[PDB]
Design a protein around this ligand. Structure first.
Ligand SMILES: OC[C@H]1O[C@@](CO)(O[C@H]2O[C@H](CO)[C@@H](O)[C@H](O)[C@H]2O)[C@@H](O)[C@@H]1O
Ligand SMILES: *P(=O)(O)OC[C@H]1O[C@@H](n2cc(C)c(=O)[nH]c2=O)C[C@@H]1N=[N+]=[N-]
Ligand SMILES: [Mg+2]
Ligand SMILES: [Mg+2]
Ligand SMILES: [Mg+2]
Ligand SMILES: [Mg+2]
Lengths: 416, 553
DNA sequence: TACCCCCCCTTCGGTGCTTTGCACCGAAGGGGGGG
């Protein structure tokens, strides 16, 4: 007998009309079974072609998990649904989460199926299960309850969620808890044993409400305190070739867009003649000071760079080769909030696409913990290549926005 | 006594009203067959007679069924279509014979008068109103409205298709050892049942269907192979396409080549090796559909090789979920690729071609990856899994390509098939500057207004050149300067440019280009032994870069 | 003088860095096929 929270799309926007993409046999089987079980329980219901909306669905296995998990690509619906910040439903973000020694990620999406969804909004959650070789036309369902993956569901569930966690919080007031979509981020400074213990307590605590008023048991362990930053570094040499100094000057001139006090006059002079790229040339006294001054400037942080909660986050990734990937997170060009590098991820030396998928997942996770937002990615990959393979490697319950770029590396800017 | 199919609530687009488009003049012969078809529908209940009170009219016309004696009523509903709510289409793809498993017993039957067996939404019926001239605009004529889904309405396929599935739903669930492929009204029914128990199940199916007002006329009830289905011929252990008619006309217009190329496309799914590049080139241009076009020498060579393929009769096999899928690709030159998908040698499930040329400058490796990607997706559509690939490319070649390329790229499990012409990289840029090779600092500039330009270089040994250029651009001259450096250097050369544009193109190791000049640079690069390209920012007074910048400005 | 789906090849205009040229991409219109 729970009353449904009304929900409206942003004025002047239609619902999502995104076509279902082809699914592998194992994925279609998982979805048919999952949707069958969900239909018996009233969680979804069958619909026809007169509902004009559609949102893609597929299935994933989380890290080290053997059980299929339904995933709806609600990105379109999420960007067409009223921002709940205006409503005041939106969750605040704790600056302390990133400072904790251990942060565990808990899947709690299952909870959301307990709460009815506003009748007038249900039509927007339409999805179509496809069939191998198109044996059947698509089978359309829509949601009756709060669906996993929709940004409205944690908003509307916040009330029940805060009430449920209230005891545990008061007992252990040092532990930070942040809710993002279908996930719970639980951070503490305890020793690992007592941390996992407290997570286990919280799990059983959630079951006690589950008994009274994909699975919960899984849990992933982050350590935000140890998250390194990868800055811009100039090479160190005793002998410089003409090639080296041309590279150094091109790099410094690019950097000058980030640190304005950087100068290349003294270094550029060393390049006056028409010399063989391979010629060794002694650095002039002026040039040595200029280089040293530039290392100093690069050592200090950029001026006037800070997080604006109203602006979107953007992430760029470069493929550096040998399993190394660099990234920058920013809101305004050349004002990077964070820079970093990944190496030796799953797929190194055999599968670029798996590596990039992991990179995107890693960066999104860092952005959620640090800012409570997911960035829009500029992916260094062809659209067709990405779209063909990425769902084979996706292990997260959210999906960030992305776009495709092709930027030949003319300066080895973020990696030497 | 049928249980009637529940209606589908259908609305018009907010604040729009029904169609009011008056009937265009109808030629005599049609008017008669039209009237008789109307009266039949009237007896059946398919169309209600009322017309005093409904202001709406939509034009009607009539065309014969395919290869049949009969006349079929079509309604021009595009106005209603614009005013009607959008629908989400449930027909996502087309069934393909190579996805079927082998069945002991098979039936193919069609539902008869599909749209007219499903009751339209009560309130929407009034908008389907139309008028037919009783006797060639002699007397007023009679107004009519549809009681079921009308042909010509954009919502008729989706609604019938979805209703058909809801009717079939319980029959499938309660006969889990039958397979039914529904495409609109066409049903394929296959079982590993004894033809007796099969004929029974079929008869059970027709009753259930007749029970919901869906007839299955005997005239459309195929019982003996070869089954005609979706434009194919299904035999018990092999399938094939229904005969392809190739126009042999000596005079070709634009439209003749379009039809021809289209038909070849359709044939490529089972006839290995079909090529359309030359024929398609003939099509490229502003030429209108009527203008006649002489076949290029190489264009009619293609057509001849095509004939040689369509001479033999090919057949595909069916799918055995227990055997791996195998895809094999061959390079056919000029950006053309064909493939075969199969599970046992020379028993192709199907074939196809990939020939899309995307990008001004590309190479064979990029094109092969694209072909792999198309084949992976086509395979997931028909079988729901990725085939093992057999490719004309050395393991070493792929490794060198994908590890050095700056975009993420990948190919799923594959092995080398030594079938020429092999895909390879035609040149490789050095990673480090070449000791003892001449360094060419190149630059090029054009005048935005004159479209006049210069390209040249200066060298660490004093060598220099400047060339005047006409009808050009900055970017062309930048490529030109690199061309000059390559033309005038030994087998090993260092080149320093400031053209982001030029370095972008060349660093992706293209082997073919839509630009003649890029092709010329590629040809030089292939002859070289070592080439090192290096970028420097312009206008920073570097090297000979500032010395060559003043030559050509 | 009609409707819905899929496919290939071409053209064409919108978009963004390679910038005021050039490259890319999606839409639409030609053809094939199904109902
Ligand atoms: O890979 C992008 C691709 O996905 C589509 C269809 O699924 O749109 C989805 O992805 C976009 C990129 O993030 C989202 O902006 C969009 O909301 C989501 O539906 C295609 O539109 C796009 O080509
Ligand atoms: P199948 O040939 O049996 O036709 C089934 C239904 O599809 C609709 N249709 C078919 C064709 C060929 C067309 O050009 N336009 C259509 O609307 C109508 C037909 N059902 N009925 N009556
Ligand atoms: Mg029929
Ligand atoms: Mg039919
Ligand atoms: Mg230049
Ligand atoms: Mg210049």
């Amino acid at each position: 007998p729970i009353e449904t929270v009304p929900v409206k799309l942003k004025p002047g926007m239609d619902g999502p009309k995104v076509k279902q993409w082809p699914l592998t046999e194992e994925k279609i089987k998982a979805l048919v079974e999952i949707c069958t079980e969900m239909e018996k329980e009233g969680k979804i219901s069958k619909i026809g072609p007169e509902n004009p909306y559609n949102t893609p669905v597929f299935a994933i296995k989380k890290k080290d998990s053997t059980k299929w998990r339904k995933l709806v690509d609600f990105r379109e619906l999420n960007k067409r649904t009223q921002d709940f910040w205006e409503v005041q439903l939106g969750i605040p973000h704790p600056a302390g989460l990133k400072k904790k020694k251990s942060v565990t990620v808990l899947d709690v999406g299952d909870a959301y199926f307990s709460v009815p969804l506003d009748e007038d909004f249900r039509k927007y959650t339409a999805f179509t299960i496809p069939s191998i070789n198109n044996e059947t036309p698509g089978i359309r369902y829509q949601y009756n309850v709060l669906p996993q993956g929709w940004k409205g569901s944690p908003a509307i569930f916040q009330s029940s969620m805060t009430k449920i966690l209230e005891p545990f919080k008061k007992q252990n007031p040092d532990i930070v808890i942040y809710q993002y979509m279908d996930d719970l981020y639980v951070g503490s400074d305890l020793e690992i044993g007592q941390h996992r213990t407290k997570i286990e307590e919280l799990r059983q605590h959630l079951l006690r409400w589950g008994l009274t008023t994909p699975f919960l048991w899984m849990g992933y362990e982050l350590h935000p305190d140890k998250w390194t930053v990868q800055p811009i570094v100039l090479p160190e040499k005793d002998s410089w070739t003409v090639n080296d100094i041309q590279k150094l000057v091109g790099k410094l001139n690019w950097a000058s867009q980030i640190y304005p006090g950087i100068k290349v006059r003294q270094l550029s002079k060393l390049l006056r003649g028409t010399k063989a790229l391979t010629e060794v040339i002694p650095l002039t006294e002026e040039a040595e000071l200029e280089l040293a001054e530039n290392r100093e400037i690069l050592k200090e942080p950029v001026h006037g760079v800070y997080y604006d909660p109203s602006k979107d986050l953007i992430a760029e990734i470069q493929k550096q080769g040998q399993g190394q990937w660099t990234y920058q997170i920013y809101q305004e060009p050349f004002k990077n909030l964070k820079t970093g590098k990944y190496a030796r991820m799953r797929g190194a030396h055999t599968n670029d696409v798996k590596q990039l998928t992991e990179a995107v997942q890693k960066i999104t996770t860092e952005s959620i913990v640090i800012w409570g937002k997911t960035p829009k990615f500029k992916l260094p990959i062809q659209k067709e290549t990405w779209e063909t393979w990425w769902t084979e490697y996706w292990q997260a319950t959210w999906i960030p926005e992305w776009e495709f770029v092709n930027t030949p590396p003319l300066v080895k800017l973020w990696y030497q | 006594p049928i249980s009637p199919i529940e209606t589908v609530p259908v609305k018009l687009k907010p604040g729009m009203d029904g169609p009011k488009v008056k009937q265009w003049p109808l030629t005599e012969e049609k008017i008669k067959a039209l009237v008789e078809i109307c009266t039949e529908m009237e007896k059946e209940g398919k169309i209600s007679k009322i017309g005093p009170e409904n202001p709406y009219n939509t034009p009607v016309f009539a065309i014969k069924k395919k290869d049949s004696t009969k006349w079929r009523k079509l309604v021009d509903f595009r106005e209603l279509n614009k005013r009607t709510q959008d629908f989400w289409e449930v027909q996502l793809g087309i069934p393909h014979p190579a996805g079927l498993k082998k069945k002991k017993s098979v039936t193919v039957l069609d539902v008869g008068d599909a749209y007219f067996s499903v009751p339209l939404d009560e309130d929407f019926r009034k908008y389907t109103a139309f008028t037919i001239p009783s006797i060639n605009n002699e007397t007023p004529g009679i107004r009519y409205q549809y009681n079921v889904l009308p042909q010509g309405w954009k919502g008729s396929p989706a609604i019938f298709q979805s209703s058909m599935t809801k009717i079939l739903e319980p029959f499938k669930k309660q006969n889990p050892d039958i397979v039914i492929y529904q495409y609109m009204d066409d049903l394929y029914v296959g079982s590993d049942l004894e033809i007796g128990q099969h004929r029974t199940k079929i008869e059970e199916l027709r009753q259930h269907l007749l029970r919901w007002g869906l007839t299955t006329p005997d005239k459309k009830h195929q019982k003996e192979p070869p089954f005609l289905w979706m434009g194919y011929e299904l035999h018990p252990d092999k399938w094939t396409v229904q005969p392809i008619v190739l126009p042999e006309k000596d005079s070709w217009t634009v439209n003749d080549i379009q039809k021809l190329v289209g038909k070849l496309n359709w044939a490529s799914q089972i006839y290995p090796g079909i090529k359309v590049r030359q024929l398609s080139k003939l099509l490229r241009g502003t030429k209108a559909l009527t203008e006649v076009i002489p076949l290029t020498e190489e264009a009619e060579l293609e057509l001849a090789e095509n004939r040689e393929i369509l001479k033999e009769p090919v057949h595909g096999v069916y799918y055995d979920p227990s055997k791996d899928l195998i895809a094999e690709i061959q390079k056919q030159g000029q950006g053309q690729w064909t493939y075969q998908i199969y599970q046992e040698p020379f028993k192709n499930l199907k074939t196809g071609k990939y020939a899309r040329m995307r990008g001004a400058h590309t190479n064979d490796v990029k094109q092969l990856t694209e072909a792999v990607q198309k084949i992976t997706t086509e395979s997931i559509v028909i079988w729901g899994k990725t085939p093992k690939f057999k490719l004309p490319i050395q393991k070493e070649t792929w490794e060198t390509w994908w590890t050095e390329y700056w975009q993420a790229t990948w190919i799923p499990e594959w092995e080398f098939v030594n079938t020429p012409p092999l895909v390879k990289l035609w040149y490789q840029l050095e990673k480090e500057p070449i000791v003892g090779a001449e360094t060419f600092y190149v630059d090029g500039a054009a005048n935005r207004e004159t479209k006049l330009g210069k390209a040249g270089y200066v060298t660490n040994k004093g060598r220099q050149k400047v060339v005047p250029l006409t009808n050009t651009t900055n970017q062309k001259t930048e490529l030109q300067a690199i061309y000059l450096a390559l033309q005038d250097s030994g087998l090993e050369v260092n080149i320093v440019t400031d053209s982001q544009y030029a370095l972008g193109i060349i660093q992706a190791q293209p082997d073919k280009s839509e630009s003649e000049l890029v092709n010329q640079i590629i040809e030089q690069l292939i002859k070289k032994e070592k080439v090192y390209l290096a970028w420097v920012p312009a206008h920073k007074g570097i090297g000979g870069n500032e010395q060559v910048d003043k030559l050509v400005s």
